[PDB]
Each structure stands twice: as structure tokens, then as C-alpha cells.
Amino acid sequence: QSLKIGIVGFGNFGQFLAKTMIKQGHTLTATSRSDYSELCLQMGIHFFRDVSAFLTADIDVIVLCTSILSLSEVVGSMPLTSLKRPTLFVDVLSVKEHPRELLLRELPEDSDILCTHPMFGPQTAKNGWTDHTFMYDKVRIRDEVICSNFIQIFATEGCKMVQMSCEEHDRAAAKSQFITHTIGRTLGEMDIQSTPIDTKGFETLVKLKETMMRNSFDLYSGLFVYNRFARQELENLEHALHKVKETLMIQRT
Amino acid sequence: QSLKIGIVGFGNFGQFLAKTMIKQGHTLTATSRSDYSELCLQMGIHFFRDVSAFLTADIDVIVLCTSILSLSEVVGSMPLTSLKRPTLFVDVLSVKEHPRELLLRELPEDSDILCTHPMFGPQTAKNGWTDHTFMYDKVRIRDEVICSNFIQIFATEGCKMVQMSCEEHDRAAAKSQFITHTIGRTLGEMDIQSTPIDTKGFETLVKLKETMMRNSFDLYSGLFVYNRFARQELENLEHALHKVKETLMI
Ligand SMILES: NC(=O)c1ccc[n+]([C@@H]2O[C@H](COP(=O)([O-])OP(=O)(O)OC[C@H]3O[C@@H](n4cnc5c(N)ncnc54)[C@H](OP(=O)(O)O)[C@@H]3O)[C@@H](O)[C@H]2O)c1
Ligand SMILES: NC(=O)c1ccc[n+]([C@@H]2O[C@H](COP(=O)([O-])OP(=O)(O)OC[C@H]3O[C@@H](n4cnc5c(N)ncnc54)[C@H](OP(=O)(O)O)[C@@H]3O)[C@@H](O)[C@H]2O)c1
Q: What is the top EC class of this enzyme, as a single word (chain B) (predicted)?
């Protein structure tokens, strides 16, 4: 079950995955917009600056770890016919309908597709992946063996494994993750500060601002722009706040 | 060190305080708008249906545990001039400038005033008060011994003891507790539910919503109406959310 895994987008998340993958014994290759050559040398990863070169490497699985906003450009510019053989493409974007559509549209037909969302990251899984949730949709899988072996990377780490459609994920995520990021950004904008009399609830909010804020704005933009279900949730949040606020006014009166 | 403590407003919080007070060996009695005779029986303490009888008892400390909204009605209705002796009044309202101003205005001059806010409750302190915060302001203390003994109730339970002015409390509380409740209430209106793919952060929010919603609307109302700093904080929240929305809409 040891795999040759190639990572596209060697940013914070890609790096986070790579650490565990290396620990498990997989052999890694990576490519990215920015230069990660030294970090890759440290880690034992074979880095290719140029995507064309990356695509000719001996890879079982290609994992797309770029930002949600950039996936279209990135995929669009890969010379996919450079692929030596049919390969599983995995995405890990925080939204799911979009990578699914793009990959189905853009990839060679004979390449498999696994759309995933590990519902955790460096800020929330500092000490291991156990009991963190890994969502996946087997969008186009023919080589079950390779697909299983990849999914096992998460399973062996103790993740709660959830198989779900990309649509179902976006629906759920809009109601849950998107809202949470939104509150977290709002708290960030407020620059909330600990006080000498924090409630436990306030404490958790301060922690939330901290974790939510350590994500890129591109990431949080992606959650909204590319989830068709997000806009309604944002309205629901506003509507709810206003409902509460008016009830207060009625009480003032 | 043992005190005769009388609770006014035997609701959720007053019951909560009483449990611990009883455990410590104080002698507790209660009075309230509603009839808590049975619950008091179960708990082992004497309930006074009428406030006059409560007031004429042998009592060392009266703890005001009514809602913030109701404190003025309650106090204004108590026949205060029936007290046998000078007595320490403690409030535990979630806002502090109002009870301070009210008590100073309305109480007999010889009665002491300790204004407090335990920053915890039955939903956050199920397993003990240890390391939860207790805020207090010694507004009008002449009998330091009784006042110290009362304070010790919190200290001996391991509370983080914080002495502060009522104004500072209300300023801080507006930025923290009130915001938290408002966010919790908003989430309640949305009726947020757990999903199969909850993030850790979302899980914290579902919990917060569940905890915040267990308070009375009266309590939440109270945080807003009687904290002069609250309204600006609501504005800050509302404005921030708007700002965030603008970055997205672009
Ligand atoms: N906890 C997490 O962070 C987490 C958890 C689950 C899923 N995800 C998902 O994992 C992906 C990566 O997340 P992230 O946290 O590392 O941060 P991110 O800001 O969403 O994405 C960063 C990566 O995107 C690349 N990138 C951005 N714009 C690009 C462009 N125009 N062209 C080419 N590459 C571009 C960056 O490349 P360079 O570094 O080379 O410049 C970097 O590798 C995202 O899709 C995110 O939704 C993240
Ligand atoms: N975790 C907490 O709940 C917590 C923590 C810290 C401080 N506090 C404070 O403790 C006080 C009590 O809180 P709570 O949680 O028990 O709930 P609450 O809804 O704020 O207040 C309930 C109490 O108020 C009494 N009351 C309400 N309206 C009244 C009226 N018009 N006339 C006479 N009595 C009236 C009720 O009397 P009856 O039950 O007899 O009807 C009950 O004893 C509040 O000031 C609150 O801010 C609460």
C-alpha cells in the first residue's frame, strides 16, 4: 500500500498532508507556483518547478492542493496529455461541486477522480488526525485498489470516514463550515480581545477568531464564491441577527 | 464562618448558588415571586412565600438573584424597613452598574452592598466552580468580616477572584459576554444542526448555541437593556459582519 504521491500546490495544506504521508512511508513528489526546493530537499520530496516535468514523473496519485480560487487556472494550464499513464487525481479543496465539475470536464477520460475534503488542518489537528473527519466522493473510480490505498492513508490515521456526494457536502458545509468561518472573520474584524472576566463561551469565541483567522482570505473567499449554497446561509445569518436585534428593541420599548 | 444566607429569586441561578452554599454549611432560606415550597422541601431549606417574613428572619446576607429586568420592581416592593438589623445585600446580576446605582439609591443606608457577577452558571460549571471567574465590587462595606466570609464562598471553591468596578465590568462584559450571547442567540434562530462533516470549530458553535439558548430571553434582554456599553458592541458586531460581507460581494 505504499504509494507514489505527487502534490500540486505545496502550500500550508499540501505540506500538512505531506508530513503524514512521509511518516507512513509513501514516496512524494511535488510541484507548485512558488519555489519549495529547499523545503522539499529537507523532507526528501522530489520537487519540480515546472508542472510539465512533474507530469512526467513516476506517480500513482496526483493530489490537488491549490487554493479553491486557483484550481481552474492551475488545471487549465497543465499539459495533461503529458501524462505517462492513467492516473488518479484527488482534490482536497474545501468546496466540492466545483472541483468535481472542473475535473470531469478537463481531465482525460481515463483518469480516475476522487473528490475529497479533509475537515481538518494544521490549526485543528496539531496532534494527529485521529477523530477528525475525512469526506470523500468516489466521483470516477475504476482502479479500486489505488483508490482504496489512498483512502487508507486517512483511515489508518483514525479519521472518521464519510462518503458523501459533492453536492451534499457543499450543502452541509454552507450551513456549517461557511458559517463558522464567517463568524470567525467577523470576530477578527472586531479584533476581539480577552478580558479579565471572560466567560467560557467567550473564550471559545476568541479561540475561534484565532483559528479562523490563520486561514488565507483566498480560502474564505473560495468558500463563498464556489459554494452555490453559501449565499443563502449568509442571508440566514443576517436575517437571524436582525430578528434577535429587533426583539431587543421591542424590549427596550 | 457559617452564614445565614437568604436568596431572593429562587430561579435557575439562585438554586444553583444555593446548592453550593448549602454544601459549605451555610444556613439557606429563600423567597421568590413563584412558589418554590416543594423544591425547597426537597432541597432541605425554608421557603418564605411572603417577603415580609423573609425580611424579618435572622439573616446575615441577602442575595439578590432575580432577573436584571425585574430588580427595580423587586427591590421597590420589599418592605426594607422591616429588617431587624443591618444586613449585607449581594447582587449577582449579569450587569453591574444598574444594581449598584439602584441599591445605593433604594436600600437603607446602614445595609451593606456587595455587587457581584459570577461568570459561570449551571450550564458551564456543572462539575464545580474551580477556575471559573467571580467578579466583585465592594460598593458599600462596613462589616468587613461578613463581607469576607461571603466572598470566601467563591474563593474556597477555587474561583478566579477578580475585583473590579461596576463600570469596568459592564465595559468588558459588553465586549465579551454580550457578544457571545448575541452570537449564540443568532445561531439559535438559525437553528444550526450538527452534520456528518462538522469542523471542530462548527462543533464549538453548536455547543455555544446550545448553552446560550438555555438562558431566559429576559436574561439576554437584560444584558442589552441595562448595560450602557452594549449597544455599541452590537453595532461593532453588526458592522463587522457587514464589512465581511462586503469583502465577499466584491
Ligand atoms: N486547514 C486547511 O488549510 C485546509 C483543510 C482542508 C482543505 N484545504 C484546502 O486545501 C487547499 C490548500 O489550502 P491552503 O491552506 O494551503 O491555502 P490556500 O490559500 O487555499 O491555497 C494555497 C495554495 O494555493 C496555491 N495557489 C494559490 N493561488 C495560485 C495560483 N494563482 N496559481 C497557482 N497556485 C496557486 C499556492 O501556491 P504556492 O504556495 O506555490 O504559491 C498554495 O500552494 C485549498 O483548496 C483548501 O481549500 C485546506
Ligand atoms: N448561569 C446563570 O443563569 C447566571 C449566571 C450569573 C448570573 N446570573 C444572574 O442571576 C439572576 C438569575 O438568573 P436566572 O438564570 O435564574 O434566570 P433569570 O430569568 O434572569 O431570573 C429568574 C428569576 O427572576 C425571578 N423573576 C423574574 N421576573 C420577576 C418578577 N417580575 N418579579 C419577581 N421575580 C421575578 C424569577 O422568580 P420566580 O422563579 O419565583 O418566578 C426567578 O427567580 C439574573 O440576574 C442573572 O442575570 C445568572
A: oxidoreductase
